Amino acid sequence: LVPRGSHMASMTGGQQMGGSMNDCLFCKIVAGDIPSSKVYEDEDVLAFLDISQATKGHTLVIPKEHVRNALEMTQTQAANLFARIPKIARALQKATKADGLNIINNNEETAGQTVFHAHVHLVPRFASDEFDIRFVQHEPDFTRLGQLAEDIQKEIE
Amino acid sequence: LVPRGSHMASMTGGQQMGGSMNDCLFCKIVAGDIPSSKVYEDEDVLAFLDISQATKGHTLVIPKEHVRNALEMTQTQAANLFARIPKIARALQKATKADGLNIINNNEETAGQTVFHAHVHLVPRFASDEFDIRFVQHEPDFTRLGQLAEDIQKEIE
Numbered sequence: 001l002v003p004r005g006s007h008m009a010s011m012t013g014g015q016q017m018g019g020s021m022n023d024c025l026f027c028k029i030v031a032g033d034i035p036s037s038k039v040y041e042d043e044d045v046l047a048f049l050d051i052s053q054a055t056k057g058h059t060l061v062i063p064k065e066h067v068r069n070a071l072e073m074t075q076t077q078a079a080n081l082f083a084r085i086p087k088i089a090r091a092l093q094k095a096t097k098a099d100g101l102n103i104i105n106n107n108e109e110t111a112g113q114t115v116f117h118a119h120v121h122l123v124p125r126f127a128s129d130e131f132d133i134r135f136v137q138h139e140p141d142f143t144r145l146g147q148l149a150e151d152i153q154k155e156i157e
Numbered sequence: 158l159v160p161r162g163s164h165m166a167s168m169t170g171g172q173q174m175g176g177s178m179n180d181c182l183f184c185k186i187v188a189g190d191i192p193s194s195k196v197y198e199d200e201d202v203l204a205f206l207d208i209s210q211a212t213k214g215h216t217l218v219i220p221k222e223h224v225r226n227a228l229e230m231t232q233t234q235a236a237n238l239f240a241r242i243p244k245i246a247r248a249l250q251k252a253t254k255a256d257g258l259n260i261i262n263n264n265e266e267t268a269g270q271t272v273f274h275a276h277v278h279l280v281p282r283f284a285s286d287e288f289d290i291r292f293v294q295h296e297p298d299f300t301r302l303g304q305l306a307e308d309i310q311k312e313i314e
């Protein structure tokens with residue numbers, strides 16, 4: 001596991017905020033210091049087009065309150081961030097006439113995270129894209145699978 | 158857009174539930190009719206290992222209440238489903254000693270959806286995987302990008 005230990009430690013991982021994180025591009029966008037291509041904003045959340053446009057309409061939805069990623073969120077932070085996502089996604093699909101949509105949150109560098117303020121990608125999909133998720137499949141060993149589930153249950157409890 | 162029109166139509170897309178959806182494998186799992194490799198359960202949510210194990214510990218988190226996908230959810234449905242996800246993800250990461258994690262929801266067939274009961278994938282990542290997300294990048298035309306954001310804003314409002 002990743003090291004912990006801060007005068008601002010959070011119970012759920014990461015740091016509590018003791019106004020914004022420094023050297024955080026997304027905090028600077030929230031503060032209005034740096035411009036973004038905005039599509040939605042309310043008291044808790046900001047959504048803007050991802051400038052790299054993995055597909056047409058690719059959007060990031062971020063909390064205004066800084067948190068590193070979902071691995072470090074409280075249930076309240078996660079509930080607040082995602083409550084807005086269906087409404088934004090419906091609008092994105094309508095505007096782009098998309099056939100489908102992927103919702104993606106990446107946590108830490110091995111999962112592709114490079115900006116350390118939580119962001120949820122909304123990636124419209126068009127029956128055409130160079131965008132893709134490689135979901136490989138394996139045949140389960142049910143005995144090992146049962147033991148893995150037991151191990152994970154232990155950690156929740 | 159996809160056709161609408163049902164005696165059980167939902168305001169947010171899809172159908173309201175008028176006890177469970179028939180011919181739904183995930184509803185049958187929720188009902189306890191079909192077994193699953195469970196890792197977490199509460200009043201609103203069930204999480205179990207995905208039998209295909211895209212990576213070690215790959216888990217699906219589903220609402221007990223049937224809804225097709227996030228495109229058709231209410232804010233309450235989305236808030237309830239994702240509130241539990243950080244806690245489950247932390248446990249999964251601890252149990253597997255994962256270096257990162259992807260959180261993914263796929264909506265409709267072009268985005269990879271094949272089971273039509275909403276499910277959020279938690280995909281542990283290990284610095285090793287054959288699992289991958291292909292996030293292609295493009296250079297923006299800022300004038301077109303600004304018009305696209307305007308169009309999307311129009312649909313939210």
Ligand code: NA
Pocket residue numbers: 010011012013014015016072073074
């Ligand atoms: Na935290």
Ligand code: NA
Pocket residue numbers: 105106112113114119
């Ligand atoms: Na990311």
Ligand code: NA
Pocket residue numbers: 167168169170171172173229230231
């Ligand atoms: Na609905």
Ligand code: NA
Pocket residue numbers: 262263269270271276
């Ligand atoms: Na899926």
Ligand SMILES: [Zn+2]
Pocket residue numbers: 021024025026027028066067116117
């Ligand atoms: Zn930030």
Ligand SMILES: [Zn+2]
Pocket residue numbers: 178181182183184185223224273274
């Ligand atoms: Zn169902």
